Subunit: 291 residues, 4 copies
């Protein structure tokens, strides 16, 4: 496995002109102390879409060099243009990332036949483990269990981050791909049911604010302490759903700032929460002892 347990999809802290490197360094050290199992850098939660190429590269290399082999670092390097996914993947490989988080194409989309060629062209280009990221609610596109079955034979493709939110489809991947594909939950509110079907962890938004809970929930579940794990899941559910009340990472960045972490403003087209949803977030942060 690239890692087991809690891999945080870390926000990118912005100053008003670029990236807050010192704040990022603080977050990285906090994650390592708090027992986060891995860092996913410049995923969707990290707003990679509104970062320039230079910012994405500086940011990914910074996380890699700061962590310095202490825990695994995974970079989001996929895009909806296959040539660009190739170039970025080779580049993060070349500077020592331990894994690649590679989203399906989105918006342009393609067929199941094109998904196979897409991911084979990216994988062929590198020698670094790859995690396929499926998130149909964002991309308009669903990579099926059959397409995944065909891809899991690839040498670098070892895992999927599964954010379809469709548990029947999760069971199908596991039954079909067996021990040739690790499953990571792509939704925090679904850690328990996914680890229960044989998943080995989560790439997590909620770990941004409670890394201990997300790590222990996985560790407990994987160790056979399924009830102790279930209770963390149920107790944090209302907070977790509050973090999805508006497009992520709007709520999780909002929350970090309410918890005095000073992580800056979102970049357009993301923006400040509306007032009613802000109040629902705060209520859940206070009930969970976070402010």
């Amino acid at each position: 496995s690239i890692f087991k347990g809690s891999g945080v999809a870390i926000i990118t802290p912005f100053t008003n002109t670029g990236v807050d490197f010192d704040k990022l360094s603080e977050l990285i050290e906090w994650h390592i102390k708090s027992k986060t199992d891995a860092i996913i850098v410049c995923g969707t939660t990290g707003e990679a879409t509104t970062m320039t190429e230079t910012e994405r590269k500086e940011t990914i290399k910074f996380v890699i060099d700061k962590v310095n082999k202490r825990i695994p670092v995974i970079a989001g390097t996929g895009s909806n243009n296959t040539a660009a996914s190739i170039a970025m993947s080779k580049w993060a490989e070349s500077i020592g990332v331990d894994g690649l988080l590679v989203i399906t194409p989105y918006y342009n989309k393609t067929t199941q036949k094109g998904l196979v060629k897409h991911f084979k062209a990216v994988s062929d280009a590198v020698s670094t483990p790859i995690i396929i990221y499926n998130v149909p609610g964002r991309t308009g596109l669903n990579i099926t269990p059959g397409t995944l079955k065909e891809l899991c034979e690839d040498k670098n493709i070892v895992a999927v981050k599964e954010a379809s939110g469709n548990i029947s489809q999760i069971a199908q991947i596991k039954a079909l791909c067996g021990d040739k594909l690790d499953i990571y939950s792509g939704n925090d509110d679904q850690i328990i049911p996914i680890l229960a079907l044989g998943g080995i962890g989560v790439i997590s938004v909620l770990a941004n604010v409670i890394p201990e809970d997300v790590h222990n929930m996985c560790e407990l579940y994987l160790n056979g302490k399924v009830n102790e794990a279930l209770k963390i899941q149920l107790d944090s559910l209302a907070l977790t759903n509050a973090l999805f009340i508006e497009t992520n990472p709007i709520p999780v960045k909002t929350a970090m700032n309410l918890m005095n972490m000073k992580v800056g403003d979102l970049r357009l087209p993301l923006c400040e929460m509306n007032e009613n949803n802000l109040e629902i977030l705060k209520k859940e942060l206070k009930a969970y002892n976070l402010m």
Copy 2:
């Protein structure tokens, strides 16, 4: 709990003019021997919709009287007409059923406000535990976790059969309703993830053909043997999905007949499978050692 583990949604075996009572008796004794935990009689799997009132009553009373207190018997008694759900519920109560399986209205539908009045009017009429049955893919209507939270305070309403297929919504019910509402999975391909979130069993189509597997999967999971339970789930997944290749109970009745159980023909508007889907079913029955 009304029961824990595997509650079979038993087919109703039809002769060419009415109900095959002798065949039903054989099925009941087989279920008790095979360690099925409870019988759900005249649910959707039992084709209650195409049975006359007299047939529904004769059938339910027969299952109750044959079982004779050996295991719990639950009757489907709900409909999309509240007066009719009342009369049928009182009637199954009066002849000694142990639970009521009461579907949300369907087709006519109603609001969340009407769902509360619907279920309160049914419950008020009886003194028998009630299981609310939510199946939005069939009814057009989704009873939300908030509406369920309000209903679980009712004296008779103790459980939900949850066939939304939405695991996020299952977590929400459990986090919100806590120990005031038992959750039964309404989908066989989702037993593991639902028991994992605190569910206490399944009202099952797949138990019609492999009652031992469905019972042991639940017993194992609930007892902490989560891996042994997971393996039954994954091994039977392809068969289970084959049983949903056409509108249930078309495939499960088709399969029982292929396994030489002689359970008769479906009633219109259900009908014989098409040929390609029939072959996919057979392949999965043979691979699972069922024919």
Copy 3:
């Protein structure tokens, strides 16, 4: 055609113990004066689901006998049980209905293969024109354009009431079935686009309150006065959507009573509107000069 233009899906006015026959008579005469083209009696808008068999029969025969050949009368006679759809269809035929409104099965559902057998078994039983009613948001089930193509060859099956709300699917039916199947819009907010694709009218909820507008919108469109028709559609759109703010016929019965028509209470599981939605309805009724 069974009729062209506006066929009202008439509410059934209830007294506190049964049916308000005098009120129904008043509504029928009002519809004929107001130039409504046809009456659909005991459809979903007429709450047939919560009427007893005797009430459904008394109600349908009353509308037929009161209208006395002045305009076409269509009865809803389908159900999700094929035997019961047969018996009811023959019965409305026998007392002189001019058309049958026959919904797809719902809740139990079936395959496309079963839909063909379902509708052939109903049609074979009668010699009265049949309108197939497709409403997947209520039934869970979508009859496809290909299945409709196969059925339109049937002698009695001449039309579809299309409430999928999917305009691409409406075009497909017309291109495929051609002049062998009349299309009626099953949504008032979609009269224009459906008549534009070759539809010949609407089976209407909004005609309950403004029969003149619904009739003229169709007459104008069919006569080539497409702009005059469009304006009625756009001006009444906000009222029309307000009539769907809660499960129909909750809002249209609520509105009739606000317009002093004294049509009684809904039957469970339908119930009174909630307050915020009630206010939105009233605002739209006042802006459209209805109260």
Copy 4:
């Protein structure tokens, strides 16, 4: 209006290393001869996603300079990064484009509140008419009629290309935004119903192969000859749906090559059609006299 009638979403013809400028010139002259009303350059149909920035700029400027004021030219300039949508929009403005086709954010997405800030930040930057492009099946994101109502007050925002495929939502935009927002259909199979609700044309994939049909269908409809327009729509429907059998522009580029137009290969992650779908396309091309 920026234009009325048929605005072709022109493919970009690729050589094996870049763009086939001579082929594009031929296509442009053919469109002008064939009476196409406007050219949309580097939209989704033009595979802008897999073109470099230099290619996108060279391509857009080429179409603008070749057309040389003969008909309106609209460039796709939006992206899911607001800064990048700003820079590209200003740039196409600066070289004389007549309109901007600006998609909602996709994949990253945002709230309705962010959509307003997104589009205001793009518009504020320019003085060129803007067409908002809504395509939730591709972006994961639906701009609502209320958000559009608020934006149509903007000085540059004059239109929407509406590809939700939801005709109820089209009526809502028109009723709400009135004469402050032109509607273009974003689906060829929905030209009739959208022009019928007050739309003024289509930004079209099907115009790539039959520009005369798409132009005449609009001209006829807008001129009151609604039946003559309807017939073009119904006759071409099966071809049109065939063009959507796989992710556009896979089928339309495939078809152009079958019609001997020599427009080159698709760029990854788009790829060649599968065989069964290829045969369905060919059958429809032959039945429509195109090969």
